[PDB]
Amino acid sequence: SDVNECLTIPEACKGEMKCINHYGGYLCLPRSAAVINDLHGEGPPPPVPPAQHPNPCPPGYEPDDQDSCVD
């Protein structure tokens, strides 16, 4: 939320990640899997990551960035 205020709707889950498709379908998954850098392997991470978001949600359903200023 850059220009967005605390008026947003709780259509995202607190403690769970928001997995949505390009059609608008909504899903929530356990926050056990963190949305971090690419897991291409161990040791050195690449200068250009092939995945800015791990996509723990089945391909087609992309993780949405949930930024809230209040409950």
Characterization of this structure:
This protein is mainly β and 71 residues long. It has one domain (1-71). Helices cover 0% and strands 21% of the residues. This is EGF-containing fibulin-like extracellular matrix protein 2.
User: What sort of overall outline do the alpha carbons produce when their principal axes are compared?
Assistant: globular
- Count of DSSP helices? 0
Distance N terminus to C terminus?
14 Å
Beta-strand percentage range: 15-25%
User: What's the total number of strands?
Assistant: 3
Structural class: mainly beta
Order of helix and strand elements from N to C terminus: EEE
The biggest beta sheet reads: 3 strands, antiparallel
Residue share in helices? under 10%
Order of the strands making up the biggest sheet: 2-1-3
Global Rg: 14 Å
Number of domains: 1
Site (Cleavage): 35-36, 38-41
Family: Belongs to the fibulin family.
Organism: Homo sapiens (Human)
Protein name: EGF-containing fibulin-like extracellular matrix protein 2
Write the layout of secondary structure elements.
Elements: E1 16-21, E2 26-30, E3 61-64
Antiparallel strand pairs: 1-2, 1-3
PDB class: signaling protein, structural protein
Keywords: secreted, Calcium, Disease mutation, Disulfide bond, EGF-like domain, Glycoprotein, Polymorphism, Structural Genomics, PSI-2, Protein Structure Initiative, Northeast Structural Genomics Consortium, nesg, metal binding protein, signaling protein
Assembly: monomeric
